[PDB]
Scaffold this active site. Structure first.
Site, PDB file in Angstrom:
ATOM      1  N   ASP B 156       0.811  -1.213   0.000  1.00 38.24           N
ATOM      2  CA  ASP B 156       0.000   0.000   0.000  1.00 38.24           C
ATOM      3  C   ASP B 156       0.842   1.259   0.000  1.00 38.24           C
ATOM      4  O   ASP B 156       0.538   2.193   0.739  1.00 38.24           O
ATOM      5  CB  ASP B 156      -0.931  -0.036   1.205  1.00 38.24           C
ATOM      6  CG  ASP B 156      -1.906   1.127   1.228  1.00 38.24           C
ATOM      7  OD1 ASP B 156      -2.345   1.553   0.127  1.00 38.24           O
ATOM      8  OD2 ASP B 156      -2.212   1.624   2.348  1.00 38.24           O
ATOM      9  N   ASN B 395       6.436  -7.520   6.869  1.00 35.81           N
ATOM     10  CA  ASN B 395       5.180  -6.859   7.193  1.00 35.81           C
ATOM     11  C   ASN B 395       4.041  -7.614   6.528  1.00 35.81           C
ATOM     12  O   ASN B 395       3.997  -7.752   5.297  1.00 35.81           O
ATOM     13  CB  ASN B 395       5.154  -5.383   6.777  1.00 35.81           C
ATOM     14  CG  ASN B 395       3.753  -4.756   6.916  1.00 35.81           C
ATOM     15  OD1 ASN B 395       3.068  -4.480   5.904  1.00 35.81           O
ATOM     16  ND2 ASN B 395       3.319  -4.545   8.160  1.00 35.81           N
ATOM     17  N   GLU B 396       3.135  -8.087   7.346  1.00 41.12           N
ATOM     18  CA  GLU B 396       1.902  -8.726   6.914  1.00 41.12           C
ATOM     19  C   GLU B 396       2.062  -9.794   5.843  1.00 41.12           C
ATOM     20  O   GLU B 396       1.361  -9.759   4.824  1.00 41.12           O
ATOM     21  CB  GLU B 396       0.937  -7.667   6.433  1.00 41.12           C
ATOM     22  CG  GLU B 396       0.629  -6.647   7.476  1.00 41.12           C
ATOM     23  CD  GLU B 396      -0.583  -5.901   7.145  1.00 41.12           C
ATOM     24  OE1 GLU B 396      -0.646  -5.410   5.993  1.00 41.12           O
ATOM     25  OE2 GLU B 396      -1.436  -5.815   8.053  1.00 41.12           O
ATOM     26  N   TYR B 452      -7.395  -3.065  12.772  1.00 38.44           N
ATOM     27  CA  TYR B 452      -8.151  -1.922  12.264  1.00 38.44           C
ATOM     28  C   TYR B 452      -9.604  -2.024  12.697  1.00 38.44           C
ATOM     29  O   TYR B 452     -10.533  -1.796  11.916  1.00 38.44           O
ATOM     30  CB  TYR B 452      -8.051  -1.794  10.749  1.00 38.44           C
ATOM     31  CG  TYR B 452      -6.685  -1.294  10.332  1.00 38.44           C
ATOM     32  CD1 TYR B 452      -6.413   0.076  10.212  1.00 38.44           C
ATOM     33  CD2 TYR B 452      -5.651  -2.190  10.096  1.00 38.44           C
ATOM     34  CE1 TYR B 452      -5.133   0.541   9.829  1.00 38.44           C
ATOM     35  CE2 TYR B 452      -4.377  -1.750   9.719  1.00 38.44           C
ATOM     36  CZ  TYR B 452      -4.124  -0.378   9.590  1.00 38.44           C
ATOM     37  OH  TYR B 452      -2.860   0.059   9.237  1.00 38.44           O
ATOM     38  N   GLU B 487       0.296  -1.141  13.976  1.00 36.54           N
ATOM     39  CA  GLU B 487      -0.539  -0.271  13.166  1.00 36.54           C
ATOM     40  C   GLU B 487      -1.966  -0.279  13.679  1.00 36.54           C
ATOM     41  O   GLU B 487      -2.529  -1.327  13.979  1.00 36.54           O
ATOM     42  CB  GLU B 487      -0.576  -0.700  11.725  1.00 36.54           C
ATOM     43  CG  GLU B 487       0.711  -0.546  11.051  1.00 36.54           C
ATOM     44  CD  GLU B 487       0.648  -0.934   9.571  1.00 36.54           C
ATOM     45  OE1 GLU B 487      -0.476  -0.937   8.983  1.00 36.54           O
ATOM     46  OE2 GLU B 487       1.734  -1.242   9.001  1.00 36.54           O
TER      47      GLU B 487
END
Ligand SMILES: CNc1nc2sc3c(N4CCN([C@@H]5O[C@H](C(=O)O)[C@@H](O)[C@H](O)[C@H]5O)CC4)nnnc3c2c2c1CCCC2
Ligand SMILES: CNc1nc2sc3c(N4CCN([C@@H]5O[C@H](C(=O)O)[C@@H](O)[C@H](O)[C@H]5O)CC4)nnnc3c2c2c1CCCC2
Ligand SMILES: CNc1nc2sc3c(N4CCNCC4)nnnc3c2c2c1CCCC2
Ligand SMILES: CNc1nc2sc3c(N4CCNCC4)nnnc3c2c2c1CCCC2
Lengths: 580, 580
Positions: B156, B395-396, B452, B487
């Site tokens: 992203d 990351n992820e 999130y 995050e």
């Protein structure tokens, strides 16, 4: 005397609001008889509303002079029975009503109601109603037109004009109710305070009886007497943010009118502004009847939105800034429990910023006669409002000039004598005056300052500004009277942000109010904090106005700036009563 | 091994940064020998900087393929004496160096340094340096190019490329220092803790002696030994927000290089992340090397501004999000005392969002070999940084898929074995994994979540979102390990405001973080809160990106959103140590 037109078994009410015909005067308007024939090549124009922003181009926005509203009227003959009246709640500046071609009424003053009867020129069939409106402002108008073909306001808001508030048609029996007055005495002594209310009805053109109900319609007492009284033990006292409104049905000669009323006491005592014998603290702001694209036009939805935001923000009061507000808004504060400082159109009575002095009698202002008719018309209109706790004779007059004291005393006196509740009187002091120099120190029950330490004075140096504000406010305390700030603020463009603040940034605005609020909190005789302004509003253009006045806590469309969250947190930790 | 080029009595440093010649490959570039002759019809292009935004139109911004940087070079013959080296700190994606027309070096990996020697192709006079850069991303690149002629990032952020960091020319004696390593053991036992540091110098191409100084240049100890040791009683421990850096002068064979170093201990213990044997709490955010119009290009001023804002905000840490940052920024956190989570280019190792599975070995990702070379190159570069307290392998990734465990264990192992300080290892878990399903529960010392709740999950229902976040985080505690959120955030357009919040409003953003922060504060094993993101940054276009990623606490130009003032107040009331 002007009662709020409502729907009663005795009286009907028909709104004339809608799209009226409309033409800008071209100079030759009155010469030719436009008020006689139907306007030709007309334009459309909603009423009620200011017309400046409702069309495109500067020609509408900046018109100097007259405009012609025109609409057709027609009543059912079966009504001639009763009295027919035309109530214009507000035509900004000068109004001139023509029916079928004849002048019927004339008015000066853009923010207060005036009526005229129609029984004897109301023809049969379709009648040509014409309302001609003038926007010119001068040393003879309140508010005051300055010298700098164009209106130049000597006041910091835009000169919105047109049929600002609604025009309705109500009727009445031939002998009718014309002005109800009520006052109250409360005996806080008893652990269950009670109260005695004094009625005073008036008729024109027979038996008259008074009914007293409670919130839910429960009757509780009756009496007869165009000047009788009434008793209420265990009385529900109207209170800030906790309104209780009784109702009152005056039946008199085939005519009945109902009135809400709240029982509360206002009284100054030393450095304490007391409501129901308790030490109040004003929390709120100065506002403006300003929305887009309505102009100064009435706006019932935004009225409720504004009051919803105030409760969200934990405020308790506002000042009818620079002019009386609509009757609807006044009644709403009654229902909702908002303390209001009712203020007149008397702004710009100050020529300071050969030189003419404000109160020169040949070359200075020519407003005192009209200023008086305003004080009377206003108190006649709002006398019975529990929300009104104080009167403001004028916003920022040159109150420390020669002629000043002589100008205002006759007006304070007229005010102190015409308020059936003998409510506190004030005037809002401009930057520059001091305790010693301000004719308000003597004439006023509450010292109301407009100070701008952190903006006009000292900005961007908030330290130097704090030193100034302590110094000045300290001195104001020597009068041993209650002092509240009715304006303080900083122009802030919603969206401009910075970590190390600069002026015009939402962060600078929050810091400004932290400094001022810190100093306010040092003096137990400060009984009020009212920020300027509640929301961004339109002004005349100039290098110092960033597309209007940007001192709002909220944008013109009611969205909060960061500072609106600062106050909401601060005001939530500060009580209506006992803060000192 | 890669030492940070500096100016020493033994070595010189000459920056090649400036406006270079530049041409977009047209396909026929390599065919014709552009790297041989001077580019013709060239364009201008500053280096160091990403080139995407430095011109107009989509043709630069969205170029698929190769570009050609080209600049002239010329060294003084009196230098051939010493070794000549070309250090490229970072060429995004693939680099290919040509001198005088011959390839000299080649590199894969856009965010780590690589060098090449020049002694034996460095001609006399003016030499034609050519750096050709490729931006193509695929299942063989880290970061990972997806399938959806255009690059489609499976990550992203925008695919900024070019000579991202600087290109310099340094020199050396023939036998030189090549890699210094230092570790520390601290004996907190004593009321005046002391420490013993272990040196380990390396040379290539003789006597070598080590000097140890303090902050101000005061020498304090000396020794000899390419693998000796050192003793320091009453040691000044580097500490978060309280950096103390000793210095170290390695003189060895006419070559001397200096190194700063801070003494501190990192150690996990149960549900406690311990720095110098104390229970730390991460405060801060995930960041991005993203500025306008630099792209991912290096930005010394914004580096200092970013760190100034962090101290203003009362933060203590940040994560090199989705790629290693510049060496300059790493040294700066050493000076300034910023705890850093150093992270690799391994983002997009996840194909979840016939279907191919992430770790299919014919059709899925092909990144493990390169992933290893990154882990080694990165730890080789930053091993001596006191600011680095932890490593992030990826990351992820699809860490709860089959193949997952097999992919990462060889990389965790390689990491745990190559860190001379045996620092904690982790990987940042995407939304969807749970304690039971996440291969990170076993391989990682710290559980790092990206959740999130309030945005992707549950927004705009913050109640339902809170219930979800309690439920999930509760479960994560059963592992008896430290869990921090790396995050959480909500897309917020600076300037959009409302009293009753809606998503994308600064008010909704503040509320989001209040809910998440309330739940975080219920679990003593939560040892960290890092918001995404520090500042708005560029992404590829799509319906879900409002002119990039708007989850910043600050705008892309570092101006604070309302939420930045919410955190500054919250973090000011939360200590670096002992919060639990
Ligand atoms: C410290 N010395 C100064 N003192 C002052 S006072 C002043 C001034 N008035 C103040 C008061 N407002 C009132 O406050 C609001 C507002 O001003 O926004 C109005 O909306 C509102 O209707 C009105 O009641 C009306 C106008 N206008 N311009 N400059 C100044 C000025 C300046 C200085 C120093 C030099 C720069 C200018
Ligand atoms: C609760 N169920 C869901 N869970 C998720 S997860 C997800 C998703 N990723 C999350 C994680 N980020 C990470 O966070 C940042 C960000 O996303 O901004 C990135 O900048 C950052 O680089 C990256 O590390 C990368 C991408 N992208 N889009 N939709 C979703 C989604 C959705 C739902 C429900 C339906 C709607 C979409
Ligand atoms: C009538 N309303 C005003 N009142 C004031 S007061 C003041 C000032 N100060 C006051 C403090 N004493 C030192 C001088 N300086 N500049 N402008 C002003 C000022 C202005 C206006 C409106 C016109 C624009 C300027
Ligand atoms: C690789 N990064 C991602 N990770 C995830 S996870 C998730 C989701 N959830 C997760 C929770 N469990 C139920 C389903 N729904 N929609 N999109 C996603 C999603 C996406 C991406 C990036 C591409 C866009 C969507």
């Amino acid at each position: 005397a002007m009662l709020y037109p409502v729907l009663t078994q005795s009286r009907l009410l028909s709104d004339l609001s809608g799209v009226w015909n409309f033409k800008l005067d071209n100079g030759k308007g009155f010469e030719e008889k436009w008020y006689e024939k139907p306007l030709k090549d007309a334009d459309t124009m909603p009423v009620p509303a200011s017309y400046n922003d409702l069309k495109e181009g500067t020609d509408f926005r900046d018109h100097y002079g007259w405009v012609f509203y025109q609409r057709n009227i027609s009543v059912p003959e079966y009504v001639k029975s009763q009295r027919i009246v035309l109530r214009c709640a507000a035509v900004t500046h000068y109004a001139m009503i023509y029916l079928n071609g004849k002048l019927i009424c004339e008015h000066k003053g853009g923010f207060l109601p005036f009526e005229v009867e129609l029984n004897d020129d109301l023809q049969d069939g379709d009648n040509l109603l014409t309302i001609a409106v003038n926007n010119v402002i001068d040393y003879t108008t309140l508010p005051v037109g300055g010298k700098a073909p164009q209106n130049n306001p000597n006041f910091d808001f835009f000169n919105y004009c047109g049929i600002t508030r609604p025009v309705k048609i109500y009727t009445t029996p031939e002998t009718y109710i014309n002005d109800i007055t009520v006052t109250a005495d409360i005996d806080f002594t008893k652990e269950e305070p009670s109260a005695v209310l004094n009625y005073n009805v008036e008729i024109k053109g027979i038996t008259c009886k008074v009914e007293l109900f409670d919130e839910e319609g429960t009757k509780l007492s009756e009496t007869e007497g165009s000047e009788g009284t009434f008793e209420i033990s265990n009385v529900r006292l109207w209170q800030p943010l906790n309104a209780y409104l009784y109702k009152i049905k005056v039946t008199a000669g085939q005519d009945v009118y109902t009135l809400p009323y709240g029982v509360r006491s206002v009284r100054v005592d030393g450095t304490k502004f007391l409501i129901n014998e308790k030490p109040f603290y004003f929390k709120g702001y100065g506002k403006h009847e300003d929305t887009f694209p309505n102009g100064r036009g009435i706006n019932l939805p935004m009225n409720t939105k504004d009051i919803s935001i105030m409760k969200w923000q934990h405020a308790n009061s506002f000042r009818t800034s620079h002019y009386p507000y609509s009757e609807e808004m006044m009644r709403l504060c009654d229902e909702e429990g908002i303390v209001v400082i009712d203020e007149t159109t008397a702004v710009g009575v100050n020529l300071q910023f050969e030189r003419i002095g404000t109160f020169d009698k040949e070359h200075g202002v020519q407003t005192q006669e009209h200023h008086k008719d305003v004080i009377r018309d206003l108190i006649s209109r709002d006398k019975n409002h529990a929300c009104v706790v104080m009167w403001s004779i004028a916003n920022e007059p040159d109150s420390a000039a020669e002629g000043a004291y002589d100008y205002f005393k006759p007006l304070y006196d007229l005010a102190r004598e015409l308020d059936p509740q003998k409510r506190p009187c004030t005037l809002v002091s401009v930057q520059g005056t001091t305790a010693d120099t301000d004719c308000s120190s003597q004439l006023s029950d509450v010292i109301c300052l407009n100070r701008y330490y952190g903006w006009y004075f000292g900005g961007p140096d908030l330290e130097v500004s704090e030193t100034g504000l302590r110094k000045e406010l300290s001195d104001w305390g020597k009068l041993g009277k209650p002092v509240m700030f009715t304006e303080y603020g900083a122009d802030t463009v919603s969206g401009l942000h910075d970590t190390t603040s600069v002026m015009y940034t939402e962060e600078y605005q929050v810091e400004y109010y932290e400094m001022n609020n810190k100093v306010f909190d040092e003096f137990d005789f400060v009984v009020g904090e009212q920020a300027w302004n509640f929301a961004d509003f339109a002004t005349s253009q100039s290098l110092l106005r960033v597309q209007g006045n940007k001192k709002g806590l909220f944008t013109r469309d009611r969205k909060p700036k960061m500072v609106a969250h600062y106050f909401r947190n601060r005001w939530s930790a500060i009580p209506e009563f006992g803060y000192k």
